[PDB]
Design a protein around this ligand. Structure first.
Ligand SMILES: [Ca+2]
Lengths: 236, 236
């Protein structure tokens, strides 16, 4: 009746989406004969995705997978760059696939392996199952299971998403820990009886953007990396 | 558009529940001072389990976790054994827990690792997520995802379960292969457009029981082990 299972937020917490979109974006445009400010594209793409996802959650748009939202969001932001109209549909599919390739932080894979030697480990992502399984496979990120909010057609912080984790692994809330670099996610899990571990990710939005990494009173654990979290849990 | 993902039946195809039941049951019964015919127990237990899954599909029984199905099936078969009435509910709980501890065939883990190096791999099981995750973890069975019929509150051969596989991994039916040692499973998947691979398991019910390992014309592959299947798919 101690901690039995750890559940992980994927974007930010485990993978560096900023460096993926900006560096692969630059390689993508170079091969095609143009250049662009990919930091701006990345920010615009993320913001447009979140606005469309919000419309799904509010019922103003029909339900669809996060991969499709990313792909429709891409069409939207490309209309504000003069080179955007030069990308055909296959070009935009390839760019959209980067969200299924988000690279790990350099602590993520070894920390995850150590944690798995002691606990059941699983994602609990807001994204599509297809994208998350590929992120984990491409990153060689070990998990006992892949779960995402898509399996209950919802989004965090809907309690159904957290309960999906408990039901799927067969444990009670106090035996589960939510691990994230986003406080809204940990707040919701804590209110449902999960233990919570915060991983500080000071470069989540790139090298130059200040991120809120300060500790909070309700965190069970405060860590600077997945490797550090494994140490404090005695998973050596 | 080429094979992208393999989906595995787990009990029987990948893990040897007969050896697990006979070995655990033998120890279970020795400490209680009686002997049982564990070959017959295994046959009856799986048959009652399958009959109850069918009731879930037919709606004669509301969906419950497969571990509750195994537990109630055990109550049913224990009326056919004189020692069965000597087992209280806690005894029966202990015996039921073996369904999350099934031992892999010797070829399963190396074959699964080779296939994962070439394809996306996933379970697609009727067992609970909790049990199948734990079977895979205890047996060091590598997968890119753990899917079970629990995620759509049904059971194979319900078409919803095969669609769950395609939606979750994000591929089309012809890009997916169902792998099983049971023909009902491959027949249903083939009818939905999957490729299918049969793995012969002549000792699924021990050395004294005959099982159907004959090939069929609709099998895309017929193999005697997961390693042999990996050889056939160019994964070695
Ligand atoms: Ca896995």
């Amino acid at each position: 009746m101690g901690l039995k299972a750890l559940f992980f937020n994927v974007q930010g917490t485990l993978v560096d989406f900023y460096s993926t979109i900006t560096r692969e974006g630059e390689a993508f445009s170079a091969v095609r004969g143009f250049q662009a400010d990919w930091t701006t594209v990345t920010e615009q793409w993320r913001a447009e995705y979140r606005s469309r996802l919000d419309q799904v959650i509010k019922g103003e748009r029909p339900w669809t997978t996060t991969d499709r939202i990313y792909r429709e969001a891409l069409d939207g932001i490309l209309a504000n760059h003069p080179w955007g109209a030069s990308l055909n549909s296959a070009d935009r599919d390839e760019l959209n696939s980067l969200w299924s390739k988000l690279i790990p932080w350099d602590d993520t894979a070894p920390g995850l392996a150590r944690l798995r030697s002691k606990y059941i480990t699983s994602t609990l992502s807001n994204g599509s199952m297809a994208s998350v399984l590929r992120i984990s496979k491409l990153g060689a990120l070990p998990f006992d299971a892949i779960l995402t909010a898509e399996l209950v057609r919802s989004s965090k912080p809907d309690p159904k998403v957290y309960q999906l984790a408990l039901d799927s692994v067969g444990i009670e809330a106090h035996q589960a820990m939510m691990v994230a670099c986003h406080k809204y996610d940990l707040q919701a899990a804590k209110r449902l009886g999960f233990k919570v571990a915060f991983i500080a990710r000071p470069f989540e939005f790139g090298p130059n953007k200040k991120v809120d990494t300060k500790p909070e009173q309700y965190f069970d654990y405060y860590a600077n990396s997945v490797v550090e979290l494994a140490g404090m849990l005695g998973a050596l």
